[PDB]
Amino acid sequence: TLSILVAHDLQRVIGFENQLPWHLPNDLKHVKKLSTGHTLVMGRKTFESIGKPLPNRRNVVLTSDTSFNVEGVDVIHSIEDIYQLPGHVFIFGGQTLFEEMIDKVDDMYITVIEGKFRGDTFFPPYTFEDWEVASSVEGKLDEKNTIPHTFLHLIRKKLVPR
């Protein structure tokens, strides 16, 4: 399986100055539970922002840098390399990788952050006409998670004769 994994706000902002614009622990827990035991594919900037590999999953970084080498990280240099990765692969970010892959993935795990943040990087536009809502689950709010958010699992609709 090839999936997108992303959090975007009401205007599809995903980032600001190489950071997440929001503080939302529950979304990072969501990410953890979905991706443990599987594979994350991320662009170089997204990796440098996180700074280290995330434990208990395969960490794959796409970069043109032939000198790139980080302990605990596998490196690829082409989009085509993604299709040779075994198992359930999650496209993890950032904007560049989402743009390159949104037309190629089977499904998307999207956290909709129900707010409007300042951003400098965006998830590409998409329409629910093309995507079936396999599930939509409201995140629970509390002391440490104060921004309303919704977990969407979207599956690409098949084109059929009407």
Ligand SMILES: NC(=O)c1ccc[n+]([C@@H]2O[C@H](COP(=O)([O-])OP(=O)(O)OC[C@H]3O[C@@H](n4cnc5c(N)ncnc54)[C@H](OP(=O)(O)O)[C@@H]3O)[C@@H](O)[C@H]2O)c1
């Ligand atoms: N909200 C979310 O869910 C989420 C998730 C992830 C990231 N983010 C945010 O997204 C932002 C970063 O996105 P970004 O687009 O600026 O950077 P990015 O996609 O994280 O990484 C860009 C880099 O990926 C490498 N790359 C991409 N496509 C390639 C290809 N076809 N071949 C070879 N290398 C390729 C290049 O690395 P080299 O330049 O080294 O060649 C490129 O400069 C950050 O603000 C981050 O916080 C948000």
Ligand SMILES: COc1cc(Cc2cnc(N)nc2N)cc(/C=C/C(=O)N2N=Cc3ccccc3[C@@H]2c2ccc(C)cc2)c1OC
């Ligand atoms: C640009 O910065 C980032 C971008 C993304 C991508 C992303 C985020 N959200 C959604 N919905 N999709 C995505 N593709 C993740 C992160 C976060 C990574 C990150 O520390 N943990 N994660 C998974 C994980 C697994 C095992 C141990 C620890 C972690 C860690 C983490 C987990 C839970 C809490 C409460 C706190 C921290 C990130 O750094 C802030």
